[PDB]
Structure formats: C-alpha cells, structure tokens
Design a protein around this nucleic acid. Structure first.
Ligand SMILES: [Mg+2]
Ligand SMILES: [Mg+2]
Ligand SMILES: [Mg+2]
Ligand SMILES: [Mg+2]
Ligand SMILES: [Mg+2]
Ligand SMILES: [Mg+2]
Ligand SMILES: [Mg+2]
Ligand SMILES: [Mg+2]
Ligand SMILES: [Mg+2]
Ligand SMILES: [Mg+2]
Ligand SMILES: [Mg+2]
Ligand SMILES: [Mg+2]
Ligand SMILES: [Mg+2]
Ligand SMILES: [Mg+2]
Ligand SMILES: [Mg+2]
Ligand SMILES: [Mg+2]
Ligand SMILES: [Mg+2]
Ligand SMILES: [Mg+2]
Ligand SMILES: [Mg+2]
Ligand SMILES: [Mg+2]
Ligand SMILES: [Mg+2]
Ligand SMILES: [Mg+2]
Ligand SMILES: [Mg+2]
Ligand SMILES: [Mg+2]
Ligand SMILES: [Mg+2]
Ligand SMILES: [Mg+2]
Ligand SMILES: [Mg+2]
Ligand SMILES: [Mg+2]
Ligand SMILES: [Mg+2]
Ligand SMILES: [Mg+2]
Ligand SMILES: [Mg+2]
Ligand SMILES: [Mg+2]
Ligand SMILES: [Mg+2]
Ligand SMILES: [Zn+2]
Lengths: 56, 336, 138
RNA sequence: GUGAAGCGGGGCGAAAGCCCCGUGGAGGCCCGAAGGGGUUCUGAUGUGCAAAUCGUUCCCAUGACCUGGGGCUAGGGGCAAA
RNA sequence: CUUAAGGUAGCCAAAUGCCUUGCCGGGUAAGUUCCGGCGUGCAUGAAUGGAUCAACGAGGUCCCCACUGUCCCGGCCCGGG
RNA sequence: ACGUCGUCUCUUCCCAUCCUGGCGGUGCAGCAGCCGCCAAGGGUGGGGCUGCCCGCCCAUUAAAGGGGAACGUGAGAUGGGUUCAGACCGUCGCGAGACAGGUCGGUCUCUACCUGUCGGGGGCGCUGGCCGCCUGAGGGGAAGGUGCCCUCAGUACGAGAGGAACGGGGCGCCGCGGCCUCUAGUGUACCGGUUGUCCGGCAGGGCACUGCCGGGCAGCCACGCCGUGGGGGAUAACCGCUGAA
RNA sequence: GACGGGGUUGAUGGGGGGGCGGUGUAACCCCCGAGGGUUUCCCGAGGGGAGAGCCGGCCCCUCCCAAUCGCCCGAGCGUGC
C-alpha cells in the first residue's frame, strides 16, 4: 500500500500492478505496464519524444 | 506396465465428466455447527467478478505476519434470500432414509415465484403449520426453502432460483424448528448467516467449455516431436491394450466444464451492505453493477461470471481456526 | 552451530534448467558455468520434465569458462539473479536484467570473497553467508 | 561473379628478377532465372487430380548441355557411361 | 617341409579385428560412436593396385559457434477440411 | 497370410516390496548398516553412451523395484537395427555365388460395417397428467502423495570423534480440481509506423495471402493465482492382560 | 440436439447518450526548420503548441427499432388380481 511511479511515463502504480525491473548496475526501476517496460528497456525509446507520455 | 513410471493423466474421481444435471448446485453435505444460536447453515449468491486486494496478514506464525500482501479476491453479488417454505424431515424406519414429512408455505408467495412454481392463489399457512406440528416429535432435521431475488442483483433477470438450506447452530431440533417457522415470509441477508473472517465452502457449476479434446480434457501429452506423426499429434497413441477392451479409465474427448465442483476453506474477507463501494467505475466486465450487499471471498470460486454460488459452513476446516478479529482489507483494486 | 536462514521457500518460476549456461557473479575464478543438477526437496520432477531452479535455489554446476585449474570441475552454486519474472509471496512481480549464480560449498559458504551486482532477497534470506557479501539486495 | 594466356604503366632494384595497378576475356569455372533433373520432409495424396501426382527443400544450368522433325538397330535378337 | 614363394614399402580394432565397449590419450558431468597413437593383423597390402585429401560432393560420420516451439510444455490466432 | 526388434503414446493388473506405513531381530551405544514379517494406497524421476533391449556411467533423490496384458498397444505413430532388389570390404568358392561378419542406400496401404469407450440427444415406462423441492440403492475416486528447514539440541548416547528421537512451528516438490485479479503468451477486433506499385497529386484506399513492423481491449490461457483433512471402526504382522487344560 | 435468460405487466439484441478502456496526438490553424529560389511571404524532410482522432465481439441510462403474427403436444376410459 505504498504507491510508486512508473520509471517511464511517471504515472502512479497502484498495488499489485506492473513489474519491478532490476538493472545490471543495481538500479531498481518500476513500470506500470508492458507498454512502458518494452519502450524503456527493449526498444530504448525516449519518454520526452513520445506524445502519449508528454500529454499524460 | 509403463516403460517409465508416472501418474495417470487426469482424475477418475470426477467420472463421468458429463454436463451437470442442473445449473444450480445441489449440495450433498451440510455440516453440524455449534454456534449457540439457530441460523441458516448456508447462503446463495451470484458470482460477479474478480479483483485483488491489499490484506494485512493476521496469522501470527506466518512468515508474512503483519505485512500487507496482495490477494486475488472474488466478489459475490448477494441480495437477500426470501424464505418461502419450511420443510421437516424424519428417518424412514424401514431403511433409515431421510424423508420429508411435510412443509408449510407462506400464504402469499411473491409473483415471481409463479414463474417457476404451480402455486394456489393462497396458501392456508395455519393449517399447514398445524399439520407440520404433528410430526415434531419424529423430526430430525429442518430446512427452509429459499428463493433468490435476481431483480435486486446485477443480472436483472426475473426467474428466481429455489433451493433448500438447513437450519443449524444448536443441537436442539425444537429450537431449530421454532427459528425456521419465524423466518416464513421474511428475507435473510448474508450478515445473518456468516461473519467476516470465517471460512466457507463454495459449491457451483464450473464454467462451460464445450466439447474438448483429450489434450485439454485430461492433460495427455502432445506426441513429442510433433511434426513426425502421421494422423495428428493432439491425441493419445494407443487407446488400449488388447484386453480388457476400451476401459472407462481411458482418456477420451468429450464435454469439458459445466460440472458441479466443491472447493473448501475460502475465507470471507468482507460482507458489505452497498455494492457501490466495490463496483469498479467501469462496472464488472460482462456482469454489471452491484447495488446491494456483497461478499468478498479470498481466492477463486468455481463457475462463470453470473453463476449462482452456494456458500456453506466448512466440512473440512483446518485444526487452527482463523483469528477472531475481522481481517484488515486495506484497499481493493476497484477503488481509486 | 551456524546461522540459520529462513525455513521457507515459496514457489518461484524457475529460470535456469539442466544444461543452461549461467555467468558467475563473484570473484571465485569461474566466469561461466553449465547447470547439471538441482539440489533439495524441490529438485524432484516427473516424466519428461527437466528440473529447474529459481533465485535462492542451490544448483550443481560445471565450470566451463574461467581459470584453467577450475575448468571441468563440479561445484555447488546459488541462483542470485534471474531474467524470468517471478511473483513474490506479497504479490510483487520482479525481474532481473541477467541470470547469475554464486559458487558455494555444499554447506552454503561462498568460495569467492565478493559478490558483484544486485542479489535477490530470496537468496540472502535463505543463505546468510551470501547476505554478508551482498552489497545490493533487492 | 571469378579473371587463364597475351598486352600497358609505375615502384624497388647492381644483373636476373620481384611487387603493385590496369587491360584482356579462357574455363566439361562459380551464384542464380528459363529449361533439364529428382535429394529431403521418409510432407500431402495413397477407392488419388494421377495404375507414380502435388507442395517443399534441393542438383545441373557454355556443355560428356537441353529440345523438335527425319532416319537406323527386332526377340535368344536389339540397345545399354552396366 | 607342404600344392611355387613365404607378405617387401606401407597401412590398420579400417566401409577389412571375431574376441571387443581391445589398451592408452582427446573431447563430455557422464562418449559401445568419433579423433590420435599402439599392433605375431580371427581374415590388411601393392595397376587383384598400396600409400595418399589439394580441389570437388544432395556421398557416410564426429566436434564447435550461432540459432531456434526439437524439447521442458503447452497456449492463442489465420485459411481450408 | 494373426504385420516381423526397439522406442513413443495410453490404460490397467500381479507381488516374490526399492521408497513411503506397521512390527521384530542384530555381532542394534549414537550416526549408519544388515536380516526377517505384514502391507501393492501412492511414488519409483532427469541425463551421457549404444538401433537397441540389457548394461555401464553422471548429477540428483525418500527411493530412483521387478513383472503380466497376442514378447499389451504399427486399420495409433516412428522406422535407427534386423530381414528383399543396388554397392563396397574381409573371408570361403575353379565358377556363378555365399556369410546370423562389417558397411552406405532402400514405398509403413484402407472413406470404420459391428462392438467397445467417451460425451451429446428423442421417446416410452414409473399404474390418471404435471410443476417444484428432496431422498440415496448402488456406482466412480489417489484426490491426495511425499520431502525440507527451525526448535528439541550440539541434548540423549559416546573415551573421543561424532551425534539422534517424540512433540511443537514454517514452507515446498509431484498429482488432482478450479479460476483470470496480477504477470506472461496470443489476440488476421482495434490503433499507429513504414516499403514497392496502382488509383493524377495531398488525403483516403487496393495488392504484396494481416505486405512487413510496434502496441493492444475482451476472450482464451500457464509460465500466473486459489483449494486440495483429520478422524472413527474392524483388522494384518504381531505385542500384551486375565487364564485353565 | 440440448441448456439458461427475456419476451411489452419488457431493457432480450440493435440504435442514441454517458462510463471505462486501446492506440498515440488526426484535420484546421500558428511558430521553428538544413538550405535553395520567382531575392525576405515560394519550395522544404522534419520539430513544437492547441485540439486529439479513430475504435471497443465491455458497463450504465434511454422504448427510438425489433422481441410480432402465429403453429402445435396434452391426462379424461374400461378390466382383473
Ligand atoms: Mg510419416
Ligand atoms: Mg559449370
Ligand atoms: Mg525414402
Ligand atoms: Mg510420404
Ligand atoms: Mg487419405
Ligand atoms: Mg547453378
Ligand atoms: Mg609388415
Ligand atoms: Mg588411408
Ligand atoms: Mg588391425
Ligand atoms: Mg569407424
Ligand atoms: Mg592377405
Ligand atoms: Mg582391392
Ligand atoms: Mg587381396
Ligand atoms: Mg588405390
Ligand atoms: Mg556430381
Ligand atoms: Mg486366417
Ligand atoms: Mg490383427
Ligand atoms: Mg490381416
Ligand atoms: Mg507379501
Ligand atoms: Mg506385441
Ligand atoms: Mg502400420
Ligand atoms: Mg493393431
Ligand atoms: Mg532402416
Ligand atoms: Mg541400414
Ligand atoms: Mg540387407
Ligand atoms: Mg579366390
Ligand atoms: Mg480413420
Ligand atoms: Mg466406494
Ligand atoms: Mg490445472
Ligand atoms: Mg500483435
Ligand atoms: Mg498518401
Ligand atoms: Mg488491383
Ligand atoms: Mg491482403
Ligand atoms: Zn508507465
């Protein structure tokens, strides 16, 4: 019952949602959805360049 | 026998896997519970959907004790049950069978009951109660006949479901009879039957899946190196030895789902009065909204998303009872 | 007697299996190992099922890449990182960027004197000797 | 696509010679359509579309190459890279 | 001595070695196959061709990297039945 | 004319029991081991080598038992070996040929008639017709099986080295039954990007068999989640009480 | 085939409005744009602002359309032990 922020889009993540991703360097990232996870990790997208993140 | 040992594929304890004879669960077993006061030993409700909740673990020996944990929960839409009749049972001396000896009905049954029953314009309840009293001294069990009120549920249908629920709680048959008679023509709400934090068994007909193959129905393996096999791979190789011939234990395709199943020891997390506090703003998918009382069960429940589900007091409760205090549901996923 | 870990081992979706090649997350000399066994009450499988392990589980490994005197030697190791996402008993879903093991003695003491990278909390709770060297615990 | 003989230029060098670049256009040469063949899936078909086929994957593809018309050799005989 | 000679150069548990998963190394966590050696070789050997692999191979085989629904272990979808 | 090895798949049965349950003996101190008896409810797995079967071996494991079913099961598969026609070697034979010696290659046919089995329907009967709620003769079940850690306790035992147990607490693995909230897969509903060409250009669109690529609701689903027990009775091997002949 | 729900005394399917959600910000308009030219009012891949736009085999509300008109099955009687 502690609310985190998506590491990509910045939205609140209610409990029981999303994944916690641990980078090789030890940094813990949280993502609200698979859409934000693949954008941030697999496809290396820039959150500032995505309109749906900018206007969220 | 087998070249390499392994357990059989699927259970033969649910043979035959036929469609349930009725869409309403028919409960075979009702426990003997000592509550100190008379009460119904079960309730019936409609399965609305599933959510997840943040619940504080209250098991002192549990490794997660005192922590907030996320649990999947099932929401039941539970409008009050309407008590239409009282039936008495005795034991037939010839064989020991339980046999109904009579029943007394409410004088003016609701008009929706006429959709399922052939009723008179008026029941003469006082005569029926008088006749019933003659069998009091041979009574061993008393049950009420309840009708659901689906108009008060999110389904909105009109035809009710009718079933018997016994009265228990005290060992004295007479007080159970007196309590059952006092219920004639009244409604019963879930809070009259259960208390939050207790365990219940659930009985329902499971979700239907139609005709299914042996791979899905019994879990037999797809033939390994699947492309090699002429005449298909979603099958058993052989269907038996030379003798005995096709046995009833051989996995075969057929109806899958729409069976009655019983699951044990599901904890009631919350019994609410108004379902607007648990209904998601989008509504329950494929169900609708809950406007009256509801039951929040921990875990999953058999049945499709509008099935009528029977809850009863547990028949195989664990040795250690759950804590007396109500469980602390911090947050439910349908809320902000 | 030695310090005890937690008595419990909750279900974890296994990430590595027989003949998986896993990097080593310590300074014991080994760099890459082949998984050849799973150790414990959870190692037992059924017909055709390949045994597998998750974070916190102990495995049997063979050194494939590393120092010349450790090559082809059989050791025990603890899974500390896992790419396969797994659900913690509190309901949190966790995944790592890579798989990793740490070489230990059969009693659970690490062979090397340092552990590189983050270590799953399942590993540190079950094996207190690993908890001692884990700089970052997640 | 490769780039034989042959033919230019440049560089090193004492002579011989060696090296780089170009030109040239050889070969039962290479990749690959047409065409020819017929390897795998032991695929489909297997009361077939078919008394030998279809898909796929393949082998050759300037030559001991593929192909039309005409002609010759006939049964204890023919013809056979067999 | 026996039907003449008496297996030379080489080559080998060979597509040729029964015994035999021969013995010793390599490679694997584990190799009845494979590779490298060994050889009184059941029953190897010189145009009956011996040795021999550059180039070539829809030939038969082993190892390594990459790769993957082959598998762990099954799921959902599309067209035609 | 009964398809010839093995394997795959799938079901069941036996017990002469490998583990799990019970008990006893021991040259049983403990930890282990060895031997016998009852007992077939459940388990008996993953790999390397070889066409195998068998066997040897590797890492685990409570243990990784053995047999029968037309050497269970090719109108279910597979086709590596054996065991056709081509070919090579060694050996034998004057020769053509031969070898259960090695070796390379070498078509696995059938629209299911009956019965069986699995599921799904129509009727007649149930002593006039019908509706609703019940009962329970019988039938099926493995619906559960089995490990680990802490405490007990570095205690009993023991010269030491070593080193238990009952009870109590926690959690898995395998199986079974559900479920779709989470996560994962899909998602030719849907939205977007973009290649070639065609519709004069823009916009919108056809085709490239969703053109390709990315995301993805519902649904389905497992790689996800939930449930999956103790008790009573008579007994087996036997251990005892009282107790005569 | 069956089963379950509704059938006007009605929210059963559709339409319309709202909720919730997927994708990713349409059109139009304004600004920036490497540079070039009818010289700085033109071309120009693209970037920014406001507005998203499209869509839902889900939920609610609302009788606007359709759940109509119709076609059938059906016990009734005797007899004996
Ligand atoms: Mg085949
Ligand atoms: Mg050529
Ligand atoms: Mg063939
Ligand atoms: Mg074929
Ligand atoms: Mg056919
Ligand atoms: Mg070619
Ligand atoms: Mg010699
Ligand atoms: Mg040679
Ligand atoms: Mg030799
Ligand atoms: Mg050889
Ligand atoms: Mg010789
Ligand atoms: Mg020769
Ligand atoms: Mg010779
Ligand atoms: Mg030669
Ligand atoms: Mg050739
Ligand atoms: Mg015959
Ligand atoms: Mg036959
Ligand atoms: Mg025959
Ligand atoms: Mg016996
Ligand atoms: Mg046989
Ligand atoms: Mg056959
Ligand atoms: Mg047969
Ligand atoms: Mg063969
Ligand atoms: Mg052969
Ligand atoms: Mg042969
Ligand atoms: Mg001769
Ligand atoms: Mg057939
Ligand atoms: Mg029984
Ligand atoms: Mg299941
Ligand atoms: Mg997609
Ligand atoms: Mg355009
Ligand atoms: Mg066109
Ligand atoms: Mg198209
Ligand atoms: Zn996000």
């Amino acid at each position: 019952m502690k609310i985190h922020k998506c590491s990509f889009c910045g939205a609140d993540i209610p409990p029981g949602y999303g994944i916690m991703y641990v980078r090789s360097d030890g940094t813990v990232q949280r993502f609200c959805s698979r859409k934000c996870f693949v954008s941030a990790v697999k496809y290396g997208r820039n959150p500032r360049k995505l309109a749906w993140v900018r206007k969220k | 026998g087998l070249k390499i040992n392994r357990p059989r594929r699927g259970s033969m304890g649910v043979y035959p896997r036929k469609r349930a004879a009725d869409i309403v669960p028919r409960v075979r077993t009702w426990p003997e519970v000592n509550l100190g006061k008379p009460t119904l030993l079960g309730f019936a409700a409609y399965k609305a959907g599933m959510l997840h909740a943040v619940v504080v673990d209250d098991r002192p020996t549990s490794p997660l004790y005192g922590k907030e944990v996320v649990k999947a929960v099932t929401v039941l839409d539970a409008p009050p049950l309407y008590v239409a009749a009282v039936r008495l049972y005795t034991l037939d001396p010839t064989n020991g069978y339980k046999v109904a000896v009579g029943e007394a009905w409410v004088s003016e049954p609701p008009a929706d009951l006429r959709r399922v029953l052939t009723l008179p314009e008026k029941f003469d309840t006082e005569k029926q109660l008088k006749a019933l009293e003659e069998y009091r001294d041979v009574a061993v069990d008393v049950r009420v006949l309840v009708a659901t009120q689906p108009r008060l549920s999110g389904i909105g249908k009109k035809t009710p479901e009718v079933l018997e629920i016994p009265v228990g709680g005290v060992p004295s048959i007479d007080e159970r009879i007196n309590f059952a008679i006092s219920l004639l023509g009244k409604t019963v709400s879930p809070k009259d039957v259960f208390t939050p934090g207790q365990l219940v068994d659930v009985i329902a007909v499971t979700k239907g899946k139609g005709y299914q193959g042996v791979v899905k129905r019994f879990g037999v393996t797809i033939l390994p190196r699947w492309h090699k096999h002429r005449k298909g791979h979603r099958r058993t190789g052989t269907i038996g030895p030379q003798a005995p011939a096709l046995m009833f234990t051989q996995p075969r395709p057929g109806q899958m789902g729409f069976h009655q199943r019983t699951e044990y020891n599901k904890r009631i997390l919350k019994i609410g009065d108004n379902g607007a506090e648990i209904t998601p703003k989008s509504g329950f998918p494929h169900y609708g909204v809950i406007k009256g009382p509801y039951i929040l069960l921990q875990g999953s429940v058999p049945g499709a998303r509008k099935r009528l589900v029977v809850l009863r007091y547990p028949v195989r409760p664990p040795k250690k009872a759950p804590p007396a205090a109500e469980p602390q549901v911090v947050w439910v996923s349908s809320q902000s | 007697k030695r310090t005890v870990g937690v008595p419990y081992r909750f279900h974890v979706t296994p990430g590595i299996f027989m003949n998986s090649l896993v990097p080593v997350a310590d300074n014991s000399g080994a760099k890459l190992v082949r998984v050849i066994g799973v150790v414990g009450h959870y190692s037992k499988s059924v017909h055709r099922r390949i045994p597998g392990a998750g974070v916190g589980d102990m495995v049997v490994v063979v050194v494939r890449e590393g120092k010349p005197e450790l090559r082809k030697q059989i050791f025990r190791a603890i899974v500390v990182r896992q790419r396969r996402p797994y659900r913690r008993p509190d309901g949190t879903w966790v995944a790592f960027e890579d798989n990793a093991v740490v070489i230990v003695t059969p009693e659970g003491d690490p062979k090397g004197s340092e552990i590189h990278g983050p270590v799953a909390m399942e590993a540190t709770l079950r094996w207190p000797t690993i908890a001692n060297l884990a700089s970052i615990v997640v």
